[PDB]
């Protein structure tokens, strides 16, 4: 039983069409609760979740103000990174920033992180010790030295230690009805055949809130992974997630094949056997 | 923000924070918050009304920002018993003030012109949020 809060920031440069666009999102566990978009009717942090709307207008004014500060910072960041990398202004480059903090069942601090990337490759990350910046390229080294001289690591320590964790505990306590749920997967199984000499079996999990699920199809023996076509977790849009794990067996009409579903909602790893 | 007062709404927002904070707990917390606010406002006025700067002036701005950070941290110590996240926000504000001063030294004045506005913007937003939080704790009582 663990929870987390994360914030994602994507600033995409638009040469010629105007100023770069900005998308900011915030997650608790796997539920989004704040959004932003530079190309929006009202440039404010519009709420999504029902449990975040309980906050007063002062909180939303503060969040909008801080996100506008972040947007100006990211525009200047695109400019300065284009300056470092000596890249032509014709191209488009996408600055990406992550930061957040995780807590356990005790709701105490466990791990805070802050990552920053220029184009896919991670540019500057913050180590688990929350002291030194992991840098990759020469420009990353220059900005690492600038931030260490500017004493930025201590502020991020003070944030991800106390402020992020206390805000997360407030969010969980305020919205316990939505976040503290743990829905068991409504698993089932489906069958299909091709050419009457080979058949596909699919183990399905339909509705469950925690995104971490483990579907393992296997034979009478254990650990048969090579034959599994496993699809990454699919958000259904209602907050629940889905996943289907399938195998293509040659024998057909087999009771030797099993599906194991491991999830927080299930007290015991649920076993599904094919039903003729 | 390019004019003489880059952001004078920090003083008004901190005055609101003080008035909504005087109803609960001792008043020296409001004293520390308001003193830190006046130091931050003086530093922003001094850096904003720049001839475009003297290193000694840089040092003075650092002194005001660090003293405001000390006021914020003492307020965080004497407020964190009630509404712990408000105390955490105060600690973050103090560390932000210290890091802003450390930037002020190690930055060109033209580069710091925007960052002073950014720091004032963030601190004003945090002050408004803190005011709302202490206000709802007042309402719950």
């Amino acid at each position: 039983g663990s929870h987390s809060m994360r914030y994602f920031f994507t600033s995409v440069s638009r040469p010629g069409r105007g100023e770069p666009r900005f998308i900011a999102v915030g997650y608790v566990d796997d539920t989004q609760f704040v959004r932003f978009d530079s190309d929006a009717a009202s440039q404010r942090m519009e709420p999504r979740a029902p449990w975040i709307e309980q906050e007063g207008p002062e909180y939303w004014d503060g969040e909008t103000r801080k996100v506008k500060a972040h947007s100006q910072t990211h525009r200047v960041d695109l400019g300065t990174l284009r300056g470092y990398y000596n890249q032509s202004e014709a191209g488009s480059h996408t600055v990406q920033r992550m930061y957040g903090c995780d807590v356990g069942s005790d709701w105490r601090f466990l791990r805070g992180y802050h990552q920053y990337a220029y184009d896919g490759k991670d540019y500057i990350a913050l180590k688990e010790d929350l002291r030194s910046w992991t840098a990759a390229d020469m420009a990353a080294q220059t900005t690492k030295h600038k931030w260490e001289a500017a004493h930025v690591a201590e502020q991020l320590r003070a944030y991800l230690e106390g402020t992020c964790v206390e805000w997360l505990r407030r969010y969980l306590e305020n919205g316990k009805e939505t976040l503290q749920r743990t829905d068991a997967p409504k698993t089932h199984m489906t069958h299909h055949a091709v050419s009457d000499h080979e058949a596909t079996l699919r183990c399905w999990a339909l509705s469950f809130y925690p995104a971490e699920i483990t579907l393992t199809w296997q034979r009478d023996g254990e650990d048969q992974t090579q034959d599994t076509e496993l699809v990454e977790t699919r958000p259904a849009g209602d907050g629940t997630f889905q996943k289907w794990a399938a195998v293509v067996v040659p024998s057909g009409q087999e009771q030797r094949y099993t599906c194991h579903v491991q999830h927080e909602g299930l007290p015991k790893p649920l076993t599904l056997r094919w039903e003729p | 923000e390019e004019l003489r007062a880059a952001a004078a709404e920090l003083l008004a927002a901190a005055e609101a924070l003080a008035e909504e904070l005087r109803r609960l707990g001792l008043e020296e917390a409001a004293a520390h918050v308001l003193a830190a606010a006046r130091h931050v406002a003086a530093a922003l006025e001094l850096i904003a009304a720049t001839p475009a700067l003297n290193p000694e002036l840089k040092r003075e701005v650092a002194a005001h920002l660090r003293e405001a950070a000390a006021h914020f941290e003492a307020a965080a110590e004497i407020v964190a018993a009630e509404d712990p996240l408000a105390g955490a926000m105060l600690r973050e504000a103090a560390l932000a003030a210290r890091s802003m001063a450390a930037y002020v030294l190690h930055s060109s004045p033209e580069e710091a012109l925007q960052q002073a506005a950014v720091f004032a913007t963030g601190l004003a937003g945090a002050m408004l949020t803190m005011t709302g939080l202490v206000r709802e704790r007042l309402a719950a009582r």
Binding site: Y7, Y59, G62, E63, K66, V67, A69, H70, T73, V76, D77, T80, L81, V95, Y99, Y116, Y123, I124, T143, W147, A150, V152, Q155, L156, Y159, T163, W167 | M89, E92, A93, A96, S99, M100, Y103, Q114, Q115, V118, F119, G122, L123, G125, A126, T129
Partner: peptide, 9 residues
């Protein structure tokens, strides 16, 4: 909430 003051990379 968010990080209050964010530096310029």
């Amino acid at each position: 909430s968010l990080l209050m003051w964010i530096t310029q990379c």
